[PDB]
Design a protein around this ligand. Sequence first.
Ligand SMILES: S=C=Nc1ccc2oc(C3=NCCN3)cc2c1
Ligand SMILES: S=C=Nc1ccc2oc(C3=NCCN3)cc2c1
Length: 567
Amino acid sequence: APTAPSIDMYGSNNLQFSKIELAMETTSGYNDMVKYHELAKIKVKFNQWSGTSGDTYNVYFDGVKVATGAITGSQTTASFEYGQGGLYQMEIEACDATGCSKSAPVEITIADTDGSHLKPLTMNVDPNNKSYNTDPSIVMGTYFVEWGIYGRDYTVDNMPVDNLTHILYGFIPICGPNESVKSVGGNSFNALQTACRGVNDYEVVIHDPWAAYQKSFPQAGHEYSTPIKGNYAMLMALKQRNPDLKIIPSIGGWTLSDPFYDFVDKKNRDTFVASVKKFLKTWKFYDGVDIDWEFPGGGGAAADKGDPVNDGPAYIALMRELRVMLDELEAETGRTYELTSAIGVGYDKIEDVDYADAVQYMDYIFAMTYDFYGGWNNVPGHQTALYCGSFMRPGQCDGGGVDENGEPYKGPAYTADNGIQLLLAQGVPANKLVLGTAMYGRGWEGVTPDTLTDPNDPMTGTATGKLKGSTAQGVWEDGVIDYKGIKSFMLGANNTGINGFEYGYDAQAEAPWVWNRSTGELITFDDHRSVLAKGNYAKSLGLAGLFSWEIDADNGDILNAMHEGMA
Ligand SMILES: S=C=Nc1ccc2oc(C3=NCCN3)cc2c1
Ligand SMILES: S=C=Nc1ccc2oc(C3=NCCN3)cc2c1
């Protein structure tokens, strides 16, 4: 009949323990900040200040004895190891010759990176996002960007998760040559250089540990002693709410592609593949890997990079090696892992890889059917059009014509259909292709009525520079504006144009635009109409479905249209 133990919370780290040890107050190399243990160390302090303390204690989780040891006077520390993540009701019993006595139960948290210790996330979704009964075999994907939590103020609990089958999390960098990241800013390059200290070149790391697992999100119940926080803890809780959702890390993108060019050497591919396997064993909520190399053959952010002879065979070899590694994981865990890639769809990008060969290893190809035209130059055009628009010259659609200076075109025009047709012509199966939608516009200023060669079509005009505006209007970088900013400040509630803009739509291209004839501002984007057209196209060709880039920029209209388009 010893006295029942009483739990010392503060000395028991508030009963928060974890299989993964994460630095919370400092920033260093990835292998200094993140250490995954097969067993969590549990240390619970209890006291017995009254009566007799007894000789031995037992610790129970949900009524099952998990530890035992000696009672040490009026305060005792039970230290033991535990391998299974979860939330458990713990009791501590003190025993002697004359009987045993149990503490009142208390919840203990043993964190693991599948979210097994988390309750389902509470969502805060804009109610403009509607509910649909889309066939569950259709891909409905979007990219969520790690940095959406700063200015854009868009967190995981804001995502319309019931309307998504795949969440691609952007972007995981590869250690090594990454000068392109300095175009984003020196802090972002410095963050990568910090993460890579003590890490071999060609291994993956987390670019922004603050956003990924350190930041406390009060909306997710996070507190000081919460063992995993950040977007990653939210994605874990999201998987608990939506256990069929696939969450896939996307490696690469525009500014993080420079190390992929070194994958012509197999040793570098080996290093990378092993590192991905270790990342997925560490962060168990992820369901696969998405390779976003921009672009094999060159044409990406680094003008000096690209080997059109060797990059495509390296890309195929990489996908083969990834699929072998992921089959090893499947065997170890009993889970299914998906292998996917986002690829350029200009004819010059498609010609540099045999995707029919690479795609036999892949579940899905995400065709980047956007960014065809944009503020990097002063040539307006439809950035995400399905077909050739009205502005194109004779012979431009197919590539056999000359431009307005007399220079021959070198290939078929940039349109989503020209890209899809080229990939199907290679032998890529329709049912592995996912068509992309932009949730943003690209834009110019100075396209005035006197620059147009066809007065009904501002895409035949000439710009003087990139669209400018404030972050309040959804302009986070010159030349680019969020769809929700176009809707609020350029379309208005009737979709006919406000603030001096008029809405236009190229019914042949299937591409909308807004134009302010006073300022020459012209923006090319995707809207309800063009997305319904993309969905109709995807249905008619037996494509796998649709994905969008990037979800924080939508107000619900684009994802709703994607569902309606596939109905
Ligand atoms: S493309 C690229 N887009 C990016 C990439 C990284 C970024 O970091 C921030 C940021 N600003 C203050 C704290 N963090 C914005 C931002 C935009
Ligand atoms: S994140 C990303 N942002 C992007 C995504 C695609 C892009 O393409 C260009 C471009 N520059 C010259 C020809 N094309 C810039 C650029 C930035």
